[PDB]
Amino acid sequence: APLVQIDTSMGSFTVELYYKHAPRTCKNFEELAKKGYYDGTIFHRIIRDFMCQGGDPTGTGRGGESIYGGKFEDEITRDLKHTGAGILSMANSGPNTNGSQFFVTLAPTPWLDGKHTIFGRVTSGMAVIKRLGNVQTDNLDRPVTEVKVIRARPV
Template sequence: MDVKGSVIFETTVGTIAFELYKDHAPKSCENFYQLAKRGYYNGTKASDNQLYNATSQKSHWCYFDFMIQGGDPTATGRGGMSIYGEKFEDEISPALKHTGAGILSMANSGPNTNGSQFFITLAPTPWLDGKHTIFGRVSAGMNVVKRTGMVQTDANDKPKQDVIIVRARVVE
């Protein structure tokens, strides 16, 4: 699980490891890696189909059999900054597709609006291809991702039970 250049999330449900695709999305990988290294995601809440970042924040939305999303310190779906400033450009690779569960991608609000938010797919999501930068995959802990994706949500797709990212760390 501890592969050089990877990112590890220790959550209240278990541990998730991410392999980063530095050759395909160098800026997105560096952003995620540095935010994890700086503790940006520590203490944040993640549940059901959304993991959330920033200190002690709640997940915003959850979508059963779709994704878990996180990385917004405001827990509104509109917050979070990248290491480059507010937003940075997409790094879409035609070779990478949202073909199944465990794909790590940048969440955004349109072209070139990447910040700190990310998502992990729970199923194939081909309609996201070409719209979201894929920058890695879950390399260990897919059972944790699946359990997180099964947390019950309310009518607004917000998790009823928080899953907390206790600590994010990097393997150097």
Template sequence: ICIRALSSSSMSVEVARSEADTGVVADRPIYNDDERCNVKLDTSMGDIEIELYWNEAPLTCKNFAGLARRQFYDNVPFHRVVRNFVIQGGDPTGTGRGGSSIWNAPFQDELNPALRHTGAGVISMANSGPNTNKSQFFITLAPTPWLDGKHSIFGRIKAGMKVVKRISLVEVDASDRPVDVLKIHRATCIPI
């Protein structure tokens, strides 16, 4: 594998060229996922800025920021809104069953006892059990202490709580899916 650096003002990107047994050469971007940032979500209801807890949840932050750098969250819906509980997104299928991590496999929980779901604006990973984190995440709308020790907290809302509040009030169906499509138009990394 030969790696060469490309210059970019918006992100650090390298291109790796590899040759398969077939002789085909493919270019694929390699991102600097260790570069710390916060993430801004440009949603259909306004902007939300997320402060990431890199010291407390480094793998989870690396995954979330890495997915944002790869435009993974662009045009992905918030597929679940439960008033006074959570707003959930990060599944490109919009079903609540999809998603992927930057490693293309589930990754381990980062359960820090110092971090708790104490109120609105906490950002955590959605999962289907221990060590099943991928791309789905949720924003709390109220204290949710029963989630402590089960979901990896990796950030908080830094700006845009009014947007979060507006999202929490949208009309939903019997399955807690927004009646009108509610999307993350774009997720971008903001250097810190």
């Protein structure tokens, strides 16, 4: 279901939420945007050429809650393949362990196809993602200038 919005301290960009190939994950992102969950919520893990992880409210990166109360299962397909930048996928700690944490990809990451459930792509504001991947990060890939998600909500 279409057009969730992230507006961050670096900018604002908007992602569609894929309905068919992954309904559980998309409903999760929809509703969590709706409830005010992805507010504050700094992009904690930014790796150039790789991804922009976000979604953990605690800022630790260790766990972000879901609408089902905990983990849920992937929706990997032979259809949904991490092929370029801007692909929005969920971050899991292995098979069938998704939380809330997501990552926008900045590059083609084949080596995640089969492990990380895609559910969308950045429809508007790829400039923000390009600028956001090149931000200064520390030895832990943590942005040295906090990149807050000042507000996330569907549109």
